[PDB]
Task: inverse folding
């Protein structure tokens, strides 16, 4: 089915994700409701849910949402249309964390305003979100941040420790964004870049334009090898760009791979001009749509007769007791998840092998 | 026939259960299950031939120590109390009916009394044999 493509339509309606500037009025929201109806009719909703979660994370972590009330009501609309409760709970937790992060940033700006840090207190924003819902990966990659940001992370860590002692903050450099100022001769144009792109651009800043090799860049940025190449793809193969900021590639080739020992160098007189006419006060966004962050059928047959065995052993049981006995029995086999047990639960009740008690919503009766 | 091997092994008594069922249509306790109306229970009894009886008695004869050291009626006290309680219920039912079951109640009471007097007789015989020697 369409799945992800349909999710793209949502990205074109709920917020200005990229080319979604075509917004007319609130009636489009009604059209979104129709899309929700499609989500009811179609199958394979896991991909759609994952795409929607990724789009929401990309929109919220960048503050590019066209509307706020529509985004808040989208959770209720999705819950009404029918979706797993885990996704709804994760969305609610993400929204609550985003709400709390505004107050945290305001408190940080209001309190730390005498140390002067490095940049002005009105130019640094801190957004701390819970890692149990807003993230899934747990891998840390060095970025070798510049000296300007080397005095801001410790201050944020100290403030978080003072206010909410008991939790550890693990900074995620992939989702961070910022604006840098260039001085490429004719026109000084602001550029929006992530942490890795900022490090790559600032590596060739301690000695004018000059020229550096791939090995030197890798040894300076200290990035995770192959991922560094991906960052280069953002600075050498920017789509719909008249002239890239880092207009170099040595032996041509392609930004995908085969970098080898290419000598990339920044173009001092690069023609990075908005509308190709006088880049006096231009601004270029280079982040783009990055948003960086036992076969099943033979295995599902294992647990159903296990549930039926638990039921045939004892007629009366509760939900918690059923879960405890099921996980007690199935330890020798694979470790059960939560989604599989739930799926088996309504597969059993839909086959009317068990009866849901009317007085008690959790009590089950064998047949 | 339905039996429970694990409970039979653990407890020590067999779990023989003989069941017939009421046919469909005739409509006229959680242990029995949820279809207690559809199926019912039956009593169980056993038999053995004269040759089987002789062979079983002669084989069980190599149990003399337990035979004269069992001292029954001290191990089956719960069974006898339950039997007396069921006797009281059956007697009440028979009295209500009189206002037959009386014969069944009499037979059950006779069985329990015979068992009790058999236990007393074995105890008396053991006392006569063991405790009345060498002053």
Result:
């Amino acid at each position: 089915k369409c799945p992800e493509l349909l999710a793209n339509y949502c990205d074109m309606l709920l917020r200005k994700t990229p080319l979604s500037k075509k917004l007319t009025s609130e009636e489009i929201e009604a059209k979104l409701k129709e899309v929700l109806l499609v989500l009811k009719y179609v199958q394979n909703k896991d991909v759609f849910m994952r795409y929607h979660k990724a789009h929401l994370t990309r929109r919220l972590i960048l503050d590019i949402s066209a509307d706020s009330e529509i985004e808040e009501n989208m959770v209720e609309w999705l819950r009404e249309v029918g979706m797993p409760a885990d996704y709804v709970n994760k969305l609610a937790r993400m929204f609550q964390d985003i709400k709390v992060s505004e107050d945290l940033n305001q408190a940080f700006k209001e309190m730390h305003k005498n140390n002067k840090l490095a940049l002005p207190a009105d130019s640094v924003n801190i957004k701390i979100l819970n890692a149990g819902a807003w993230s899934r990966s747990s891998e840390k990659v060095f970025v070798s941040l510049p000296t300007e940001l080397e005095d801001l992370i410790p201050e944020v860590e100290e403030f978080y420790k003072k206010n909410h002692s008991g939790r550890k903050l693990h900074w995620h450099h992939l989702m961070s964004n910022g604006i840098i100022t260039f001085k490429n001769e004719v026109g000084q144009y602001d550029l929006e870049v992530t942490t890795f792109q900022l490090a790559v651009l600032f590596a060739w800043n301690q000695r004018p334009r000059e020229k550096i090799s791939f090995e030197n860049l890798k040894l300076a940025t200290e990035l995770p090898d192959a991922e560094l190449r991906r960052t280069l793809w953002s600075l050498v193969a920017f789509p719909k760009l008249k002239r890239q900021v880092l207009l170099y590639e040595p032996q041509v080739n392609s930004p995908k791979d085969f970098t080898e020992g290419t000598l990339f160098s920044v173009n001092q007189e690069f023609s990075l001009i908005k509308n190709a006419k006088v880049q006096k006060r231009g601004k270029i966004n280079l982040i783009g749509r990055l948003q960086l962050t036992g076969i099943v059928q033979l295995r599902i047959l294992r647990t159903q007769e296990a549930i039926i065995q638990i039921m045939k052993m004892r007629k009366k049981i509760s939900n918690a007791q059923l879960q405890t006995e099921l996980v007690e029995i199935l330890k020798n086999m694979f470790l059960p998840q939560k989604k599989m047990i739930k799926e088996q639960i309504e597969w059993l009740i839909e086959h009317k092998y068990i009866r849901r008690d009317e007085s008690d919503i959790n009590t089950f009766i064998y047949m | 026939v339905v039996i429970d091997p694990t409970r039979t092994i653990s407890a020590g008594k067999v779990n023989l259960g003989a069941f017939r069922t009421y046919p469909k249509g005739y409509k006229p306790i959680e242990d029995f299950g949820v279809h207690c109306k559809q199926y019912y229970a039956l009593e169980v009894s056993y038999f053995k031939s004269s040759l089987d009886r002789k062979l079983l008695e002669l084989l069980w004869n190599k149990y003399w120590v337990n035979t004269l050291s069992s001292s029954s009626l001290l191990t089956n006290a719960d069974y006898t109390t339950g039997q007396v309680f069921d006797l009281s219920e059956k007697l009440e039912q028979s009295e209500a009916q009189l206002g037959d079951k009386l014969a069944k109640a009499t037979r059950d009471s006779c069985k329990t009394t015979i068992e009790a007097i058999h236990g007393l007789m074995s105890q008396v015989i053991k006392d006569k044999l063991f405790n009345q020697i060498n002053i």
Notes: The first strand of chain A starts at residue 177 and ends at 181.
